[PDB]
Structure formats: C-alpha cells, structure tokens
Amino acid sequence: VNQHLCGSHLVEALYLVCGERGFFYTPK
Amino acid sequence: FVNQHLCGSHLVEALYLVCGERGFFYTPK
Amino acid sequence: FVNQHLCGSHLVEALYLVCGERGFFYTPKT
Amino acid sequence: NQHLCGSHLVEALYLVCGERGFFYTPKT
Amino acid sequence: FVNQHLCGSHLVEALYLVCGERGFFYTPK
Amino acid sequence: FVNQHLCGSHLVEALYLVCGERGFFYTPKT
Amino acid sequence: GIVEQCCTSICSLYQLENYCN
Amino acid sequence: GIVEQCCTSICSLYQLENYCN
Amino acid sequence: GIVEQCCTSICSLYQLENYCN
Amino acid sequence: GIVEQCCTSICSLYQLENYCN
Amino acid sequence: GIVEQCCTSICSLYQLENYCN
Amino acid sequence: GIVEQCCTSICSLYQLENYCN
Ligand SMILES: Cc1cccc(O)c1
Ligand SMILES: Cc1cccc(O)c1
Ligand SMILES: Cc1cccc(O)c1
Ligand SMILES: Cc1cccc(O)c1
Ligand SMILES: Cc1cccc(O)c1
Ligand SMILES: Cc1cccc(O)c1
Ligand SMILES: [Zn+2]
Ligand SMILES: [Zn+2]
DSSP states (O other), X not given: OHHHHHHHHHHXXXXXXXXXXOEEEOXX | OHHHHHHHHXXXXXXXXXXXXXXXXXXXO | OHHHHHHHHHXXXXXXXXXXXXXXXXXXXX | OHHHHHHHXXXXXXXXXXXXXXXXXXXX | OHHHHHHHHHHHHHXXXXXXXXXXXXXXX | OHHHHHXXXXXXXXXXXXXXXXXXXXXXXX | OXXXXXXXXXXXXXXXXXXXX | OHHHHHTTSOOOXXXXXXXXX | OHHHHHXXXXXXXXXXXXXXX | OHHHHHTXXXXXXXXXXXXXX | OHHHHHSSXXXXXXXXXXXXO | OHHXXXXXXXXXXXXXXXXXX
C-alpha cells in the first residue's frame, strides 16, 4: 500500500523527468 | 504546448491506476 | 495521522477517475 | 480541461473539508 | 527518507491552495 | 484565471521535485 | 454544478466549503 | 469506511466503484 | 497515440486500458 | 520548520498558512 | 515571472531549477 | 524493479532517467 502510494509519485516524477520521450513503467 | 503537458500529467496517473501490476508504456509522440 | 491523510488524497483522485461522470461521496470516518 | 480541473477541485475539497468529507456530483 | 519526500509533495500542493496570490516558501530542512 | 491556477499547481510539484533539500519560494505575482 | 461554478470562474475556499457535507 | 478498507490493503477499481454515485 | 485520443476528448478507463502492458 | 511540524502530526490549513509569504 | 515564462510554453526541469534557492 | 529501488530507498532524477524511452 505504501509502495502503491509511492508508485503514484514515481510515475509523476518519471513524467516530469522524461518529458517528450516518455517512459516505461512497471512494478515488476 | 502547455495544455498537452498538463493533460499528460493526469493521463499517467490514470494509467498507473488502470494498468495496475502490468505497468504501462507512455509515449507523447 | 499523516499517511491516512496522505492516503485519502490518493483515494479521492482514484475515485474521481473511477467514478467519472457519476461522481462520488467521500466520508473518511464512519 | 473542465475534466482536468475537476481533479484539482476534488483535491481542494478533500483538503478544505477535512474529516467532514464531501459529495462530488458534477451535475447538481 | 522516502515518506518525508511523499509528505512534502502533498504539503506544497496544500500551500499552493491555501496561500493563493501571496504564494509560499517551502524550505524543508 | 483558472488556467493559470491549474498550471501553477503543476509548476510547484515540478519545483518540489527538482529543488529537493534546497526548497524554493513561489510567488505568482513576481 | 461545482465544475461550472468553480472551473470557469475561481472559487474561494469559503465557496468550496459549501460542498463539504 | 473507504479509508479503513483501501488505506490498509490495496482495493481494486471495482471495489472503489462501490463509492461512486 | 494517447495524447491524440485522450487529451482532445475524455477517454474512459476501458479506453485507457488499451495503453497498458 | 514545516517538515517537523506537519509531517509528524497533521496540520490544519490555518497552521499551513504560517508558511505563506 | 515563473507563471508567464512556464505556463505559456513548456519549461524543462533544468530551467525550473533556476528558481530553487 | 523501479518500485523496490525507488520506494524503499530514495532515487535521484538521474536514476529515474534510466526509465525514459
Ligand atoms: C481551489 C480551487 C481549485 C480549482 C478551481 C477552483 O475554482 C478553486
Ligand atoms: C489510494 C488508493 C488508490 C487505489 C487503491 C487503493 O487501495 C488506494
Ligand atoms: C482519466 C483521464 C485523464 C486524462 C485524459 C483523459 O481522457 C482521461
Ligand atoms: C494538508 C497536509 C498535507 C501534508 C501534511 C499535513 O500535515 C497537512
Ligand atoms: C513541469 C511543468 C509544469 C507546468 C508548466 C511547465 O512549463 C512545466
Ligand atoms: C522523485 C521520487 C518519487 C518517489 C520515490 C523516489 O525515490 C523518488
Ligand atoms: Zn492538472
Ligand atoms: Zn502521496
């Protein structure tokens, strides 16, 4: 659950960091 | 274009929730 | 406490998404 | 846009309303 | 610590909302 | 205007991330 | 609706309080 | 409550749908 | 892509599900 | 600072107002 | 200021880092 | 995975940049 909440922030961070090229996300 | 950046921010959270354990590929272009 | 408060923040975003046009009710305690 | 704005609205409500909670009904 | 980062993220949104035109300062340490 | 309000909302999250430990000031006026 | 009332024009925190139950 | 259910364990979206109108 | 479909009009979760892995 | 005050126990919006400019 | 510079067109994170103290 | 690397310990922006396309 904490990791699920963290993941939510992670993907936003990835979004901002990666910009135009986008990104790949998976919690493996 | 700023509106598309703003939309993208919400899209990726929607994807995160919908796609769950599978994860997702995000490509603007 | 904090993470309950933080967690509810994410719940309301999720409900907004899930419920779309239908809308929803949020009452934390109960 | 309105759709995106409502997402910020519900977060504002969550925060303003505290333990009272709130009803979100986008056509009432 | 990660929890702290997560809390600060919510804090700045709340400050944005509450402070309005005045704006705010976020200085964690 | 609400479109500026909404953009600002995202801006401060971006600032939070990039600034980290250092923090930031946010004043929409100037 | 709240979306029409608060997304077209900016709502004060007092106006948002109306929608709390 | 929704907090008691979904902040302790992870709810599915179908479970979250129970809180829709 | 997703920006074409879902930023110009409101996609459902089922539509968004198309872009999952 | 804000972190010690508000990330240990929850702050009201009026306590968060202490960090407005 | 930051609103006029970054809400009209997209600012990178590198550019935004100039607003850190 | 990214969750184990960046939620148990903190990741830098540079580490996150590995996940860009
Ligand atoms: C606080 C807030 C958020 C979004 C729209 C509004 O009118 C007000
Ligand atoms: C915050 C959140 C979102 C989705 C499911 C959950 O159990 C919790
Ligand atoms: C849920 C969501 C977010 C962003 C765009 C959409 O079409 C739908
Ligand atoms: C509104 C809010 C966010 C994060 C921490 C707090 O104490 C309060
Ligand atoms: C990251 C971000 C948010 C909002 C506007 C911008 O130009 C950039
Ligand atoms: C930016 C960010 C968000 C969440 C977890 C991290 O390690 C880093
Ligand atoms: Zn937004
Ligand atoms: Zn969070």
